[PDB]
């Protein structure tokens, strides 16, 4: 706990002390590139992708 460090009760941590939820959100667009080119939502196949 020297030089601004601290000791935590590992027992307490198990009991839920200081736990937190974490939510990240990923976004994605299906963009339209002009008259013909359009992105697609699908599972890509490794042979033609």
């Amino acid at each position: 706990n020297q030089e601004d460090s601290m000791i935590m009760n590992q027992s307490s941590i198990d009991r839920g002390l200081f736990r937190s939820l974490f939510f990240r959100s990923y976004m994605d667009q299906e963009k339209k590139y002009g008259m013909s080119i359009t992105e697609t939502f699908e599972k890509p196949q490794r042979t033609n992708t």
Partner: protein, 299 residues
């Protein structure tokens, strides 16, 4: 790329981006070591840097599909600038400048879409339809304000943005038969359901009415009850049937006004559909007030 050691026809290879290597998944031979981040590399061309402080920002993105490849900066005011040299170097760009100015007809399309409440994908199709047909000998000498009025319905008819030809007649301009022939010589190089949302909104009807009118109109066509009447009339008629069936009614005069049809014509379609009103309605329609199928005007 294909592994020099193995060589199987479907060349199974992975891009281990994290270690910056391109590996053959079978033998494990590394096929490349120099590997670049395309996201961050693209960040150097299209960034958020408008001020000019980013040393990473060093290029700019262009659109080779629409404006070809015309690289050109603009003489403008900087921090330490005399307003004299800007004028001279700009008055000097005037002598070096016809078709490089007809690109301001894109500004005519952009200002028309924004006046017609049209999306960013429609403008870019109208600008590509106009670039590939404004110098055609097949169009020759058509009304130059009616060939760009026709390329907006060409851009809307691919981007799935419902816009009747009479909707673009209201914008500019359009001479009907003149921008109707031009809409065909370029084409060589709507439905009931389309109008229903807008007309209903102006009508001030509920979702329930809209849905039923929408169902009736489709059935009317499916049934082929209205042989050749214009879809706008069909829709206005169907709106009349459904609305009359529900509590908040709208009259022919009011429906016609919104649909931009005439009561007589709405009457014409309506009576044709009325006979099969039963078949027309959605099944779980709830006629309210006092308007059941039997009671509908029948007019």
């Amino acid at each position: 790329l294909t592994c020099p050691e193995c060589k199987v026809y479907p060349p199974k290879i992975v891009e281990r981006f994290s270690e910056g290597d391109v590996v053959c998944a079978l033998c494990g031979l590394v096929l490349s070591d120099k590997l670049v981040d395309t996201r961050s590399e693209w960040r150097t061309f299209s960034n958020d840097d408008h001020n000019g402080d980013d040393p990473s920002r060093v290029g700019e993105a262009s659109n080779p599909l629409l404006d070809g490849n015309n690289l050109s900066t603009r003489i403008g005011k900087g921090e330490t600038t005399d307003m004299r040299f800007t004028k001279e170097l700009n008055k000097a760009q005037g002598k070096n400048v016809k078709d490089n100015e007809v690109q301001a007809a894109f500004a005519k399309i952009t200002m028309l879409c924004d006046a017609a409440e049209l999306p960013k994908i429609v403008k870019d199709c109208a600008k590509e339809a106009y670039k590939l047909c404004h110098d055609e000998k097949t169009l020759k000498g058509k009304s130059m304000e009616s060939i760009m009025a026709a390329s907006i319905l060409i851009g809307c008819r691919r981007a799935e943005v419902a816009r009747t030809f009479k909707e673009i007649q209201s914008l500019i301009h359009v001479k009907t038969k003149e921008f109707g022939k031009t809409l065909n010589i370029m084409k060589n190089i709507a439905q009931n359901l389309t109008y229903i949302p807008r007309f209903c909104s102006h009508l001030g009807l509920p979702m329930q009415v809209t849905t039923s009118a929408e169902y009736t109109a489709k059935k009317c066509k499916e049934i082929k009850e209205i042989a050749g009447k214009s879809p706008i009339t069909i829709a206005v008629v169907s709106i009349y049937l459904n609305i009359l069936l529900f509590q908040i009614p709208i009259t022919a005069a009011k429906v016609g006004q919104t649909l931009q049809v005439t009561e007589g014509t709405i009457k014409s379609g309506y009576k044709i559909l009325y006979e099969h009103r039963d078949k027309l309605v959605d099944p779980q329609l709830i006629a309210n007030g006092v308007v059941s199928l039997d009671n509908l005007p029948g007019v």
